[model samples]
Target chain A: KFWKISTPPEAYWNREQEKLNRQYNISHLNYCEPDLRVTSVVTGFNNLPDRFKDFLLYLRCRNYSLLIDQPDKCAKKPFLLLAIKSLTPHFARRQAIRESWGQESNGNQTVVRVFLLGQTPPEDNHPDLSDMLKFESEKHQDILMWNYRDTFFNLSLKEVLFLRWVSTSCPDTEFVFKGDDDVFVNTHHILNYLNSLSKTKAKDLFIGDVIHNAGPHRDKKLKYYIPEVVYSGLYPPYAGGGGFLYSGHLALRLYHITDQVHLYPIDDVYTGMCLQKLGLVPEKHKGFRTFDIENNICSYVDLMLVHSRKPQEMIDIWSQLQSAHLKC
Target chain B: PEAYWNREQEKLNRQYNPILSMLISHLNYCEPDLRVTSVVTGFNNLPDRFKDFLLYLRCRNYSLLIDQPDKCAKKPFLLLAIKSLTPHFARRQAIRESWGQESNGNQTVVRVFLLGQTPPEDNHPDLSDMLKFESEKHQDILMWNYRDTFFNLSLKEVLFLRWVSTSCPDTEFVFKGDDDVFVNTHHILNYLNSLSKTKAKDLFIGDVIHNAGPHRDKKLKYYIPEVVYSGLYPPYAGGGGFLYSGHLALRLYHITDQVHLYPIDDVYTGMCLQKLGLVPEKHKGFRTFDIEKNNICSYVDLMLVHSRKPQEMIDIWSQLQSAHLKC
Candidate 1:
């Protein structure tokens, strides 16, 4: 009733063992330095991206300081919470979101808007933009920031940290629409879709342009390339990071369920992994597109979110989507 | 400090995930399923002994098959807690007749040998009836139902601590050692008398190891996978033997909840002590690593020495006790 005593590949076995402990006994862990074997298992791991090295080095460290918080943002128990992942330098995009599709007053839907961010330290050659970030946070009160670096590879940290915030602060919230800051969201369509869900369906709501049959990129030149020794196997169905919708109840469960899942570099794939560990599948919907779609108003009006929009483009699309004179 | 106990009880009560529960079940042992399996992938590559250890790692309260509820009622000066196996009858009897005598001059000394179940599959002669007879005659055996293996020592330590808290709370001091180690209880008592009240109450001493990390060599018994744990191990007294105040044992019982129980028992004990901002004090008198023989007086000076033959213990004790033998 068990596998034979024959040993498997070294790195693959270690990684699998790590995942088992993370999923089963994560709470038993405290702060730990990156295992040197992480790179040794994968050939040429030293030559991998610096961000990957940083991530693996600090994988066990998830509880970063909450630099900025909005504890009372969901006091009204908002029906739809708009969560946008943003970086410190993207102030214009955040303001654009507030002015456009992320408006809290939009449609009287009891919507609460928030932007998730991580730090950009001066050591990384980024100027001290923290003062402006603080000003923006104070003025908006919709920003949540952790003290860790806002590296793209560590974006999974951004995803997980917000999942925790939802559980601890905004647990009463009914539905969450997590998306990217630059994307244009049709708030009207999203609220209507959420409002139309049956109780059973609403409780388990998770929909976006779900990708299936996707695994790690083995191509060295690809931006998302992952070494097979570090991780192998097809990624579970997960929604695009550009936008996805799920219930607050599911969000809380996911937060606790993270005990059984380890941090993966890709944010969307990690989210998919969490959903998979929870025995839930992310559903596909044509309304969400993480990649840019054709520039057309009819295409924009029917969608919940479209990716690759600038701040000005976000404003323009919001105006066009709300236009009474426009005939899509 | 006992309020600490309730916190562990509840946290373990509400949170029993699969791998988490298996690793920490001794805290809430009776609640989790008794049926055990290797939850980790590729765990079969490990030796059979380690495999069984993982299967029952969380088994905290395997029913007390042999217990002495009244053993500590008189509040003895020291409890000689010898960690023994079910099959080591020669060593048990040898120690009982020699160093484990129930009296150390004016003060009372108590003895109890720790045991765990030896399965029939291991093909040893069935010692159940014999062990029961031994327990009845000596009334000093403390046995639990869990399978006895080297890796399961952490669980055995927990079970022993539980029993101490339950029935032997009043025993003033404890000198825990392996069955084969020869202890100079008189020398230990003299050392305790020399210590000030502050040091006596907090006394924990042995052959302490410092600044050690996992042995990366897989062939070694102490090998730890980087995936399982990767950090400098806390300073720990060697498992050969350790002498500590019974009060320290009670504190360890409560504090053990906070530390992850490693496969190694002594290492886990050090971790618990570390959590409480303490480290085992090293003592030269504890020659846990066996010393090369010198004069008879040299043996008389030490508190504990590791590894002794059953006959060797009796012979050495006779020589040490002889009126003709002088340092």
Candidate 2:
């Protein structure tokens, strides 16, 4: 039903796209260089008013911009790059997050950078990501393609394409983790876990929660029967909607084959089905159980990262993790 | 001499004209020494077209010379020749501008004619016509209608200068006395200066109507609303004989606009005054009684007495000065 792509003003889009590109390179330099072109499309924020914007700004101001500088580095190249894309343009809040990122230190190594998509660049020379929108529309042939369900069945296909996009555009970025504004991430632990992984396991596609036998049953309208999708049987386990990470080398291979894969509605299922189609196995890690605080403890000391714990809970959870004894 | 005599004869015609009779006796009751000048105007004139012209002259301190211009010419006066005029914007403008000029210099005082009717369009100079004459000649004339709008705007402008500022830069004392009030300037000045020496913050007002009760219903001071203030309002000061400190006058102007406009003049002033944190100091000597009480007994040689007393003002003022010389 959608029409042909109408490109926006080149000056505006080019300027915006440059910003995304710069951020992809400059941010989280210790980790894998970010792929700025891959923007997560969010639709529900337009309904939020200024107060909600203020609350989000407050959260970002408190968190983000962590640099863990250490004399003893875990590896020459760190995997697991965390990237957040938010639509709100709060200049003060962005500056505060930038300051926070500047202050983090593990052994004096800085790893994270927050990317703001909607803000106008300070000057003409500044990197602009505005063109990324046009690029997505013209190339992807879909406006909201990054949705979990839409890419679920073609998981490996989408993952490979995303990874390759990041590798070619951002060779320095080791791992790419696309996250929502509302989710909390445990950056250090996730990076440590990925650092410990062997080359064979590093290439394995790992998703947190595995909801088995999740498909449409026409007889049961209540059971996963989304109005107009074709999948009728059980889907493979995949990462939850909050976020998933990929090693930079693996991301390169995924990006090259992504175009050949079909699109799916669910993100995790798309990853599962795509990997299954590629003769690649999708590994399920117990530590990454879709961010449940009910157990209060995990048997696997090296959890990749929890998803969707909420921005407000990040401070408490991060503090608790620091205080808790992890046997790993 | 005949003109003076004729004015004196008219004074006798009015039953309330006590100054003619008590002119000599009330002199002793006046405060002996003072350093300020006070003026009061009575709207005794019948409402007419050019009355505002005369008000302009009054506000400017210009005394009209009825018969001989040569005699009053040395005094630097504004002669309003209009015979009949109603209160209008031009009149208000004339008054505001004239007062504004005199407001700076303490030495300048206004003398005005309280006409029996609005000035006549006797091809004799009307206030507007005079203002036009001066402006055309590039003499810096100022006059406007003294209507509601004029009052409202002027009040705001004056308040801005007076209150929110570090210090009051305008006149030290403001006489908001009524039109019919008779004021003996020399006497009033002495009382004000004496009070000034005592470091009095506010001065010159008649007693407020105070009823000690819980019901905050005073129709006169409608600003007695609960929302504007807590508890029962301060006593509502009488409006007839108010002599505000320049600072308070400024404050009154600043706050009066925010208050919902009340029709009663007295209540409005009281509300405005209260909001400014100015305490109203009532003086028993200030008489605002009716014309029936215009006799020697009520004549205190005080700052002001309102209504039925206009004809007595000039004579009483002159008599007080002469009496001071005699003392």
Per-candidate TM-scores read 0.47, 0.31
Candidate 1 residue lDDT tens string, B203-296: 8999999988888798898876553555678899985889898899899998766554577888888987876778799999888676445556
DockQ of 2: 0.01
What tens digits encode model 2's per-residue C-alpha lDDT throughout B105-184?
23333332222212322211123333233233322222322232221322222322322232223445545443445554
Cα error, residue B31 of model 1, in Å, equals: 86
Give the per-residue lDDT digits (tens) of candidate 1, residues A1-328: 3377533344452365476765565432335556665676555578767877877667766877788999999888689899999876565567778878888863446999999999877455343456556766787799899988888888878888899899889999899989888688888889888889999999888999899999889897898887665566778898865889999989998888775677788889888888987889998988887777545777777778888887667777777777733686
DockQ for every model comes to: 0.00, 0.01
User: After aligning candidate 2 to the native by TM-score, how far in Å is the CA of A271 from where it should be?
Assistant: 3.0
Docking quality class, candidate 2:
incorrect
Q: For candidate 1, what is the recovered fraction of reference interface contacts?
A: 0.00
Tens digit of lDDT per residue, candidate 2, span A151-212?
12223323443343355345555566664444555565666776777878766545455556
- Two-chain DockQ for model 1: 0.00
Model 2 chain A weakest lDDT span, ten residues long:
A60-69
Model 1 residue A308 CA deviation (Å) reads: 0.9
